[PDB]
Amino acid sequence: LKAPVVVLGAGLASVSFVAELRQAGYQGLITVVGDEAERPYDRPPLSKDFMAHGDAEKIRLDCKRAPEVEWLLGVTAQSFDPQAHTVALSDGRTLPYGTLVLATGAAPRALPTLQGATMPVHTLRTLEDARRIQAGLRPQSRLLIVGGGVIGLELAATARTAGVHVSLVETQPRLMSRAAPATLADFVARYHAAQGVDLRFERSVTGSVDGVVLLDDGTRIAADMVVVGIGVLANDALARAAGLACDDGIFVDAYGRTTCPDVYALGDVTRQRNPLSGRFERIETWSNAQNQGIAVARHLVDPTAPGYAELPWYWSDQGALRIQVAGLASGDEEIVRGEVSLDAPKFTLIELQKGRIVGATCVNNARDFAPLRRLLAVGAKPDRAALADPATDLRKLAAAV
Amino acid sequence: LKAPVVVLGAGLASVSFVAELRQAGYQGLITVVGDEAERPYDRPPLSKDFMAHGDAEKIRLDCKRAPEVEWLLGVTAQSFDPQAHTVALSDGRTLPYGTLVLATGAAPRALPTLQGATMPVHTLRTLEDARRIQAGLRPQSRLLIVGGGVIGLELAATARTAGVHVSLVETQPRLMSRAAPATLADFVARYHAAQGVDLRFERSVTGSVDGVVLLDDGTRIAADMVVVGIGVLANDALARAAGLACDDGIFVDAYGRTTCPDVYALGDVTRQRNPLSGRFERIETWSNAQNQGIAVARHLVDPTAPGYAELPWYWSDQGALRIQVAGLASGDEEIVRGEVSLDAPKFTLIELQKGRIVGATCVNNARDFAPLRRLLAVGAKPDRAALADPATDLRKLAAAV
Ligand SMILES: Cc1cc2nc3c(=O)[nH]c(=O)nc-3n(C[C@H](O)[C@H](O)[C@H](O)COP(=O)(O)OP(=O)(O)OC[C@H]3O[C@@H](n4cnc5c(N)ncnc54)[C@H](O)[C@@H]3O)c2cc1C
Numbered sequence: 150l151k152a153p154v155v156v157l158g159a160g161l162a163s164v165s166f167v168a169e170l171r172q173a174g175y176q177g178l179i180t181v182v183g184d185e186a187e188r189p190y191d192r193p194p195l196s197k198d199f200m201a202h203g204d205a206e207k208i209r210l211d212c213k214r215a216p217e218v219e220w221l222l223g224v225t226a227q228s229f230d231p232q233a234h235t236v237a238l239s240d241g242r243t244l245p246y247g248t249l250v251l252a253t254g255a256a257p258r259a260l261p262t263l264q265g266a267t268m269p270v271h272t273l274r275t276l277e278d279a280r281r282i283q284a285g286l287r288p289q290s291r292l293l294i295v296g297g298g299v300i301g302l303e304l305a306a307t308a309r310t311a312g313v314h315v316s317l318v319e320t321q322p323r324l325m326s327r328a329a330p331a332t333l334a335d336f337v338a339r340y341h342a343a344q345g346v347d348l349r350f351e352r353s354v355t356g357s358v359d360g361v362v363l364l365d366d367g368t369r370i371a372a373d374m375v376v377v378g379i380g381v382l383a384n385d386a387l388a389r390a391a392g393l394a395c396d397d398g399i400f401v402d403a404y405g406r407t408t409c410p411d412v413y414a415l416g417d418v419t420r421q422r423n424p425l426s427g428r429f430e431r432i433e434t435w436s437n438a439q440n441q442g443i444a445v446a447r448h449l450v451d452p453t454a455p456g457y458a459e460l461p462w463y464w465s466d467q468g469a470l471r472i473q474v475a476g477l478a479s480g481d482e483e484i485v486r487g488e489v490s491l492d493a494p495k496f497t498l499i500e501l502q503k504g505r506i507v508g509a510t511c512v513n514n515a516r517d518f519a520p521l522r523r524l525l526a527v528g529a530k531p532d533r534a535a536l537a538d539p540a541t542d543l544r545k546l547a548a549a550v
Numbered sequence: 551l552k553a554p555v556v557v558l559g560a561g562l563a564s565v566s567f568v569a570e571l572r573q574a575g576y577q578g579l580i581t582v583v584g585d586e587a588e589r590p591y592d593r594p595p596l597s598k599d600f601m602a603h604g605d606a607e608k609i610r611l612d613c614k615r616a617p618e619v620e621w622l623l624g625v626t627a628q629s630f631d632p633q634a635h636t637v638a639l640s641d642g643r644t645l646p647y648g649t650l651v652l653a654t655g656a657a658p659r660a661l662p663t664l665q666g667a668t669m670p671v672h673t674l675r676t677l678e679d680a681r682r683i684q685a686g687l688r689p690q691s692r693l694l695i696v697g698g699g700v701i702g703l704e705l706a707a708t709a710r711t712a713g714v715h716v717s718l719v720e721t722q723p724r725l726m727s728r729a730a731p732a733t734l735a736d737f738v739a740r741y742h743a744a745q746g747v748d749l750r751f752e753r754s755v756t757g758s759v760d761g762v763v764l765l766d767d768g769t770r771i772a773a774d775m776v777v778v779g780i781g782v783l784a785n786d787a788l789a790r791a792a793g794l795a796c797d798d799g800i801f802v803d804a805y806g807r808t809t810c811p812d813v814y815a816l817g818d819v820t821r822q823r824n825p826l827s828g829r830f831e832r833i834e835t836w837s838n839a840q841n842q843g844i845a846v847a848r849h850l851v852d853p854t855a856p857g858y859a860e861l862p863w864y865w866s867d868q869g870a871l872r873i874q875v876a877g878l879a880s881g882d883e884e885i886v887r888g889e890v891s892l893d894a895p896k897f898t899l900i901e902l903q904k905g906r907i908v909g910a911t912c913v914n915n916a917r918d919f920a921p922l923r924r925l926l927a928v929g930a931k932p933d934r935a936a937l938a939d940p941a942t943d944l945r946k947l948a949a950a951v
C-alpha cells in the first residue's frame with residue numbers, strides 16, 4: 150500500500166473499497182474517478198423499487214464511512230501509464246498514484262441484430278437507463294425483453310405490475326441459465342407465465358423492421374420498446390491498453406492484484422477464482438462487489454489479513470418471488486425442502502456433491518438462507534434425511550457444525 | 551530485471567529464456583532448478599525418431615548460448631516465498647531471488663477409470679516415459695491408445711512402423727479436436743485407418759479387467775499396453791500455493807508477468823492471450839515454449855522491447871504425413887490448395903475470416919508454410935481465386951504484402 154490511492158470507477162466496489170481503507174486505518178490521499186455525473190448509487194433498485202417509484206434519493210450509497218475522499222464525478226479516466234504511475238483524465242488533468250485500483254464494472258452487451266433498429270432499444274445498467282425505460286412503461290404498451298436473466302425478469306415483473314404487456318425471448322430452453330438450479334428456473338418460468346408474460350424459449354432475434362422484431366423461427370413480435378438483457382462485458386479497456394492480463398475481465402488473485410505491479414482490480418470488472426468450482430469466473434453480483442472491495446482494501450492496509458475468500462451468492466426480487474441463491478447451481482444431488490407451488494410459493498433447494506453442500510436456494514424464505522450459507526461455507530456434510538425432513542431447523546444445525 | 555534470476559523447470563522454455571537473457575546482455579546470476587535428472591532435452595522426438603531409434607544424445611537442447619548458468623538437475627522446487635524472495639528445494643537448500651521465473655510445464659492427465667488397472671498403463675511426456683513405452687513395443691503385441699491428439703497419433707504411427715498392432719479410442723467424433731481443421735482431421739483418420747490403426751470414435755473408457763479395457767458402448771478391447779494421451783494439466787502447484795492467479799495454468803500478460811510482483815511464467819505452464827482469438831488459452835506447443843521464453847527474457851533485459859506477440863503454430867510427424875498447422879482451425883471460409891488424397895499426400899488449407907487469413911495447414915509442403923505464416927502475421931486479405939489457383943506462388947505474395 151503506497152500512497153496516493155487512485156480508484157477508477159465510483160460504483161459499489163469502489164465505495165466499499167475506499168470505506169474499508171479508511172476503517173482499516175489508511176490516512177493517505179484517496180481520489181476516486183467516476184464517469185457518471187451522479188452521487189454514487191446502488192444498481193439493484195433500478196429493476197426493482199426505483200423502476201416502480203422513481204426516487205433516486207433512496208438508492209444512494211453511504212460514503213460516510215469513507216471520509217476525506219475526493220470524488221471526481223462526471224470524469225472519465227482515458228488511460229494510465231503504469232511506468233510513470235499516472236492516470237490521464239477526460240478533463241485534461243493527470244493524477245499521480247502509488248496504488249491504482251480498477252473498479253470500472255461492466256456494461257450491457259449490445260445485440261448485433263438490432264444495431265440498425267428504428268424503434269426504441271434500450272439496455273438497463275445505469276440510473277439514466279432506468280429513467281429512460283421507465284419513461285416508456287406506458288400502461289397497456291408492449292415491451293419485449295431479450296434475455297431471460299435475472300435483470301430481464303425483474304423488469305418483466307415490474308412492467309407487469311405497471312400494466313405493461315410483456316413478451317420475453319430467450320435463446321436457451323430455460324430462464325436464468327447462468328447461475329440458477331434448473332428446478333428454480335422451471336418454477337420461475339411458471340410464475341412469470343401465470344402473471345401474463347409471453348415467454349419464448351429457444352428463440353433468437355434476427356432483426357427488426359418498422360416497430361417489429363424478427364425471430365429465428367421466421368416469426369414476428371410487435372413492441373413499443375425493446376430492452377436487451379443478454380449479459381454484460383467487463384469494462385477492461387484501460388487495463389488492456391496498459392498491458393494487463395485480461396479476457397472479458399481483468400485477471401486478479403485473491404489479493405486483487407493484476408499482472409501489473411501496483412495495480413489492483415475489484416468487482417464486476419474482474420475475472421477471479423470461484424472457490425467452490427476452483428475455476429476462474431467473472432462474478433456479476435452485488436455481494437462480490439462489496440465483499441471483494443472490502444477484502445482487497447483490508448489486505449492492502451494489513452498484509453497479514455487473508456485474501457478474499459467469500460463464497461458467491463445473490464438475490465433477485467421478481468414480483469411475489471423473493472429469490473436467494475448461493476454457491477453452485479448443481480452438484481450430484483438436489484434436496485427439496487417444502488412444496489414447489491404457485492400457491493403461496495415457499496421452498497428451499499440444497500445442492501450437494503458427494504454429500505457436501507455446494508449450493509442453496511431459498512424462495513420466500515430468508516430465515517433458511519443465512520444458516521445454509523454457513524453450512525455451505527464450511528462444506529458441511531449433514532444427514533440428507535434431516536436436510537429433507539421438514540422438522541429440521543437449519544439454524545441449530547449451522548450452530549452445531 | 552533484478553538479480554539473481556532463478557528459473558523453476560529446465561525444459562525448452564527455461565533453456566530458451568536463459569539463453570536469451572545471456573544473449574541480450576544480462577550478466578548476473580542465473581540458477582535453474584530441474585526436477586528431472588537429465589541433461590535438458592527436447593520432447594518432440596519422444597513420439598518420433600527417439601521412440602523409433604532410442605539415442606537420447608540426439609535430443610539434447612543446446613545450452614551453449616546459455617553460459618554461466620548453474621543447472622540444479624534432479625532437484626524439485628517445493629515452494630517459494632514471494633515476500634522473503636526465496637525458493638525451498640527438495641535437497642534442503644534455499645535459493646534467493648530478485649526475479650523468479652516459473653517454467654514448470656505440464657503433465658499428462660490421468661484417466662480416472664483406469665486408476666486401479668492391473669495391466670500396463672502409461673503416459674508419454676518424459677524421456678523415462680518414452681524408454682518405458684519403447685521397452686514394450688514388442689512386434690505383434692497390441693497397443694491401445696486413449697485419445698486422438700497429435701502425440702497419440704505420432705505414437706500410433708511409430709508403433710505401426712515397429713510392427714505393433716494399434717487400436718485407438720477417441721471420445722470426440724474426430725481426431726485432433728483441439729487445434730486442427732476438420733478437413734485435416736478427417737484426412738488424418740483415413741490415413742491412420744489405411745495404415746492398420748483400429749480407430750474407435752465417440753467412445754470412452756469405463757474401466758479395465760484382467761488385461762482388457764472396457765468401453766462405454768458395452769464392448770471390450772484387449773491390449774498388452776495402454777498409453778493414455780487425453781491432454782495435459784499445467785504444473786502450477788507452486789504458483790497456486792504462493793497466491794498467484796491460476797486456473798489449470800498461470801495467468802500471464804505479454805511480458806510474462808504473473809499477479810505476483812517479481813514472478814514471471816513461461817511455456818506450457820501459462821495461460822495467455824492468443825492474439826488471433828483475443829482469448830486466453832493454455833498453449834501447448836514447442837514454438838510457444840521457445841518464442842515466449844525468448845520474448846519474456848528480451849523484455850526483462852530491455853524494457854523498451856515489445857511484449858510477446860508471435861502467432862501460434864505447431865507441426866506433427868505421423869508416418870508419411872508431415873503436418874504443419876498455424877493460427878486458428880477455422881474461420882468463415884476454407885480454401886483447399888491441391889487434392890486431398892492418400893496417393894502421395896500433399897495439400898494446403900487456408901482459413902479465412904471476412905477475407906482475412908486466420909490459419910493455414912500444410913501436409914507435406916514445408917515450402918508453402920513459411921509464406922503462409924507471414925501472410926497470417928499481417929492478417930493479409932489476398933485474392934481468394936489466386937489463393938485457390940494452383941498457378942499462384944505464395945512466397946512472392948508474402949514478399950509483396
Ligand atoms: C439493473 C441491475 C440490477 C441488479 N440487481 C442485482 C441484485 O438484485 N442482486 C445482485 O447480487 N446484484 C445485482 N446487480 C449487480 C450489481 O449491481 C453489480 O454486481 C455491481 O453494480 C457491480 O459493482 P461494481 O462497482 O463492480 O461496478 P459498477 O457498478 O458497474 O461501477 C463501475 C463504475 O465505473 C464507471 N467507469 C467505467 N469506466 C470508467 C472510466 N474509464 N473512468 C471512470 N469511470 C468509469 C462505470 O460507468 C460505473 O459507474 C444488478 C445490476 C443492475 C445493473
Ligand SMILES: Cc1cc2nc3c(=O)[nH]c(=O)nc-3n(C[C@H](O)[C@H](O)[C@H](O)COP(=O)(O)OP(=O)(O)OC[C@H]3O[C@@H](n4cnc5c(N)ncnc54)[C@H](O)[C@@H]3O)c2cc1C
Nearest residue numbers: 559561562563585593594627654655817818834835836864
Ligand atoms: C511426446 C511429446 C511430443 C511432442 N511433440 C511436439 C511437436 O511435434 N510439436 C510441437 O509444437 N510441440 C510438441 N510437443 C510439445 C512441446 O514439447 C511442449 O510444448 C514443450 O515441452 C513445453 O516446454 P516447457 O519448457 O514449457 O515445459 P516442459 O518441457 O514440461 O519443462 C518443464 C520442466 O519443469 C519440470 N518441473 C515441474 N515442476 C517442477 C518443480 N517443482 N521443480 C523443478 N522442476 C519442475 C518438469 O518436470 C519439466 O522437466 C510434444 C511434447 C511431448 C511430451
